[PDB]
């Protein structure tokens, strides 16, 4: 039904670690932009328009990162863990999931914030920005086809 956001350390890998940013303790909210920007190289001669090649540019995704710890100790351990896990691997695979599709985007940590403006039981509300490596790709199994008489 609703949208799902997984954060994989190494998708396709034996050492994969999955973070549910939609259901788990560390949650991602309000993505900045999931769309795209394009530079079409349109040069015009005497009012007539000629179009070059479109360079589809992908923009940084900024999430409202929230932590759901029970104690100040929990919320700090969640920030010290989640952020370092993204740092340990050179790039992290964000999975976009919905009723119709299951796309993936390879992200690199652009900016993470840590402030002392806490709620109840030391709750965290910070902004996490990621740089786009490759936006939306389908990771699927490939198998041979058999021919029958």
């Amino acid at each position: 039904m609703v949208r799902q956001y997984k954060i994989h350390t190494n998708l396709d890998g034996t050492d994969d670690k999955v973070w549910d940013v939609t259901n788990g303790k560390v949650r991602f909210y309000q993505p900045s932009n999931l769309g795209l920007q394009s530079t079409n190289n349109i040069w015009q001669s005497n009012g007539i328009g000629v179009m070059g090649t479109r360079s589809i540019t992908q923009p940084q995704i900024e999430f409202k990162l929230e932590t759901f710890g029970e104690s100040l100790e929990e919320n700090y351990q969640l920030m010290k863990d989640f952020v370092n896990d993204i740092l340990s691997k050179k790039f992290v695979t964000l999975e976009y999931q919905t009723e119709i599709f299951q796309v993936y985007a390879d992200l690199a940590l652009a900016d993470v914030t840590k402030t002392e403006g806490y709620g109840k039981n030391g709750t965290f509300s910070e902004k996490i920005t990621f740089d786009i490596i490759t936006k939306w790709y389908t990771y699927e199994n490939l198998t041979f086809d058999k021919i029958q008489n």
Partner: protein, 186 residues
């Protein structure tokens, strides 16, 4: 020329080799006739194949034997539109057979051992015109593709230019060609 890395022709020889290419898709090259539209981001610039001098008019001075000085007045030589070189004083025409702009230079010559003035032909070589050649850089047309080392006859803005495809740029955005007009028109 095009440099290419390719494994040795014989299956016995396991070596990877580097060779230089001076070969074409056709052994006996044929001339193509095509059109280049202004939409292909065309860049027109003039190249010079042969080195010949640029001052079409010559204020020629001849040194006097008796004074061993340039005491005598100069003789002016003008190159006609046809290609011939005549003395300016000898001209009796209406200006139609002479150039549209007068590029001039002053030349100094020393009299030969015989004492005779320098040959008209020797002056002619120095005032003679250079090969004005047109270069066209444009986008690759998928309707009629033009590859490197192909003899072509390009139509651009109502004017016909004849020559070959010298270079080709493989970029991320476009695929472009360098056309060099070989000249030798009349």
């Amino acid at each position: 020329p095009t440099t290419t890395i390719q494994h040795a022709p014989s299956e016995t020889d396991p070596r990877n080799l580097l060779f230089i290419n001076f070969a074409s898709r056709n052994w006996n090259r044929k001339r193509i006739t095509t059109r280049v539209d202004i939409k292909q981001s065309v860049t027109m610039d003039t190249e010079t194949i042969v080195d010949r001098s640029a001052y079409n008019f010559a204020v020629v001075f001849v040194k006097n034997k008796a004074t061993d000085d340039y005491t005598d007045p100069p003789k002016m030589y003008i190159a006609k539109n046809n290609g011939d070189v005549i003395d300016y004083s000898t001209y009796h025409g209406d200006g139609t057979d002479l150039p549209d702009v007068r590029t001039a230079k002053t030349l100094f010559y020393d009299r030969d051992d015989h004492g005779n003035p320098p040959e008209l032909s020797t002056i002619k070589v120095e005032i003679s015109p250079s090969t004005i050649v047109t270069r066209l850089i444009f986008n690759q047309n998928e309707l009629l593709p033009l590859y490197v080392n192909d003899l072509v006859d390009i139509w651009y803005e109502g004017k016909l230019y004849s020559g070959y495809i010298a270079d080709r740029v493989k970029t991320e955005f476009n695929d472009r060609l360098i056309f060099v007009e070989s000249g030798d028109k009349p």
